[PDB]
């Protein structure tokens, strides 16, 4: 029972106004309802387009890190 509920802090609507309000709010709600897991596609990632010095620490902290983050 530990979830955030909608609160009507002020006002005492009757069942009809409550129903209208909830219907409108549900209609307003949207966006990604139950989206699939976002597909990984590292092809042509910006990090791969950079010039790295042969001894650059960013070869570890930026390039390898980006390729390995999962």
């Amino acid at each position: 029972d530990h979830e955030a509920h909608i609160k009507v802090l002020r006002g005492e609507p009757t069942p009809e106004e409550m129903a209208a309000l909830m219907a409108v709010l549900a209609s307003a709600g949207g966006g990604p309802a139950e989206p699939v897991k976002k597909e990984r596609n590292m092809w042509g990632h910006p990090v791969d387009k950079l010039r790295y010095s042969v001894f650059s620490w960013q070869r570890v902290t930026l390039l390898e890190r980006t390729h390995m983050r999962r």
């Binding site: 069942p15 409550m18 909830m22 219907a23 209609s27 307003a28």
Partner: peptide, 25 residues
């Protein structure tokens, strides 16, 4: 132009709610 009809059960009481079919936000 079309209208959508939905059913709500506030406190168990059945209610029929008519909303515009193109409701935005």
């Amino acid at each position: 132009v079309p209208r959508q009809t939905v059913v709500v059960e506030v406190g168990g009481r059945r209610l029929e709610v008519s909303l515009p079919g193109d409701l935005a936000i």
